[PDB]
Design a protein around this ligand. Structure first.
Ligand SMILES: CN(C)c1cccc2c(S(=O)(=O)N(C)CC(=O)O)cccc12
Length: 569
């Protein structure tokens, strides 16, 4: 009995939570009630299996049971069987479900609902998140949950809750989005590029983190870790949760052989331990490490070793190079690893290999500088424009690159691209690259997945499937779409009403930003000079209308003077 197995392992509290998440993530439209209903029914069934490990259908696989249970509330998918049925669902998850924005009632109402029924108050939380982020790292979602409970449990019994909860709640919403994003990259990697790619990323990323660990140790870690995520990303939430626990345990027992900063982590509860380990800082770099050139360019056995086990060899190369370069971004390490491979491949076929692959490191110099120069520039610019304006600059720049993309997606992607500035730039040269380019991999992955739902630009398609690690270079390379045909104005699109006044300060810029896009799609060839001169104008249109007697018509009048002058520039 599989259900029973996992149950004993996770216990009832986690088993129930993990199953509610799986249901919310599969059928994101169905109400809270129905999932709560199916979860209970299923959990009860599990209880009868722990006892009689041969009762009803305790023999069957998790998918079958889970599949049949949802199929009692859904159709084509449920028409299929075992494998096809499950893949079906996986292919229907929606990365941008059309759900109602989620608004939070007054502090008073939340504390009452929380104190009254606690289990419910949290289950609903899990439900609203798992349905909006169908790829949220399941185990980690339970961690946030405990943190969300501690927030209320503490703030609801204080002097000023609004002051105590609201903040902690914001910190959580953001980090929850961050978390969702990274995990979406891992799944995208695994699903669109294979496990080979995911492994490569794991090696470099972990070798940087555990410089002292041995190659055969990291290799072990990477193998398990791969499994964990392979499972979560495919929907096998229970086992993912289990395996992840195992991996946390192991890493803790064997600290000494892995890292010296894992102390703090292993002295805490499960959910907090796991989260702690995955985010630990890089251990100090071992003192006397030889030069790479020795065993990788100078040696005369290279090609031989490469031919014997190309995988273990390149893997070792990556580990070696990463471990001594925590200043390099994971994607940069992989680019290098890829250049070395292409070199051996052609060089090992020549007359005198040694001579051909002798100057490989000169190939590396250009690749290492490209990122450094780009980071240096854009942060210089960030420092001078500030976040909002910088976001607007990235807005104009990306709309000229891929004009077909939907205004909503452009606005979202460009806004996030701007945040990178604020997160990284403040770091010293030494840690800028990992921060900057790894974040950029996440944000552009967002653009890719949203776009794959409804492909309108071949340029985005090419850049998203050609290479995972070169996505950024691909995009930076693009300048302006020379074949794009300018759109034709629409009154409705540029009609500013008074309803923009009730909207928060942010919801405003967001409006002015959506207008900036619409304009660019209209005058691709326009210039940054003109655009600015026009933007500032829109600012005026809001201050006036919004504060000028009973005017819901100002929007049409002041708006007329707007489009008039707009059509002019
Ligand atoms: C760290 N941060 C300031 C950044 C460094 C390098 C490139 C960045 C980019 S970007 O998309 O690569 N970009 C502006 C380069 C380009 O469009 O060719 C966006 C946002 C922040 C960036």
């Amino acid at each position: 009995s599989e259900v029973a197995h996992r149950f004993k392992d996770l216990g009832e509290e986690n088993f129930k939570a993990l199953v509610l998440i799986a249901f919310a993530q599969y059928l994101q439209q169905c109400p809270f009630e129905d999932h709560v209903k199916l979860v209970n029914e299923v959990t009860e069934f599990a209880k009868t299996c722990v006892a009689d490990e041969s009762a009803e259908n305790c023999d069957k696989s998790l998918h079958t049971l889970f599949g049949d249970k949802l199929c009692t509330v859904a159709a084509d998918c449920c028409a299929k069987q075992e494998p096809e049925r499950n893949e079906c669902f996986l292919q229907h998850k929606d990365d941008n479900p059309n759900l109602p924005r989620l608004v939070r009632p007054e502090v008073d109402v939340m504390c009452t609902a929380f104190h009254d029924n606690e289990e419910t108050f949290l289950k609903k939380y899990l439900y609203e998140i798992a349905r909006r982020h169908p790829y949220f790292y399941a185990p980690e979602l339970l961690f946030f949950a405990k943190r969300y409970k501690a927030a209320f449990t503490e703030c609801c019994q204080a002097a000023d809750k609004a002051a105590c909860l609201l903040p902690k709640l914001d910190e959580l919403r953001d980090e929850g989005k961050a978390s969702s994003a990274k995990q979406r990259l891992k799944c995208a990697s695994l699903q669109k590029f294979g496990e080979r790619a995911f492994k490569a990323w794991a090696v470099a990323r972990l070798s940087q983190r555990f410089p002292k660990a041995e190659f055969a140790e990291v290799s072990k870690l990477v193998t398990d870790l791969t499994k964990v995520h392979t499972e979560c990303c495919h929907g096998d939430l229970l086992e993912c949760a289990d395996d992840r626990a195992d991996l946390a345990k192991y890493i803790c027992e064997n600290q000494d052989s892995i890292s010296s900063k894992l102390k703090e982590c292993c002295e805490k509860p499960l959910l907090e331990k796991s989260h702690c380990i995955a985010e630990v800082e890089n251990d100090e770099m071992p003192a006397d490490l030889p030069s790479l050139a020795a065993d990788f360019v100078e040696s005369k056995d290279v090609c031989k070793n490469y031919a014997e086990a190309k995988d273990v060899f390149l893997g070792m190369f990556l580990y070696e190079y990463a471990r001594r370069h925590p200043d390099y971004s994971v994607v940069l390490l992989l680019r290098l690893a890829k250049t070395y491979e292409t070199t051996l491949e052609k060089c090992c076929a020549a007359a005198d290999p040694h001579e051909c692959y002798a100057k490989v490191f000169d190939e590396f110099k250009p690749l290492v500088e490209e990122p450094q120069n780009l980071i240096k520039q854009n942060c210089e610019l960030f420092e001078q424009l500030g976040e909002y304006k910088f976001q607007n600059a990235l807005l104009v720049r990306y709309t000229k690159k891929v004009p077909q993309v939907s205004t909503p997606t452009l606005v979202e992607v460009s806004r996030n691209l701007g945040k990178v500035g604020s997160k990284c730039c403040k770091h010293p040269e030494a840690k800028r690259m990992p921060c900057a380019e790894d974040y950029l991999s996440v944000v552009l992955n967002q653009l890719c997945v949203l776009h794959e739902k409804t492909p309108v630009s071949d340029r985005v398609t090419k850049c998203c499937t050609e290479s995972l690690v070169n996505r950024r270079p691909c995009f930076s390379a693009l300048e302006v779409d020379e074949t794009y045909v300018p759109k034709e104005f629409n009154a409705e699109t540029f009609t500013f009403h008074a309803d923009i006044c009730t909207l928060s300060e942010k919801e405003r810029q967001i409006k002015k930003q959506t207008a900036l896009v619409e304009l660019v799609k209209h005058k691709p060839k326009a210039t940054k000079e003109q655009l600015k001169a026009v933007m500032d104008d829109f600012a005026a249109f809001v201050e006036k209308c919004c504060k000028a007697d009973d005017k819901e018509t100002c929007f049409a009048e002041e708006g007329k003077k707007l489009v008039a002058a707009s059509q002019a520039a």
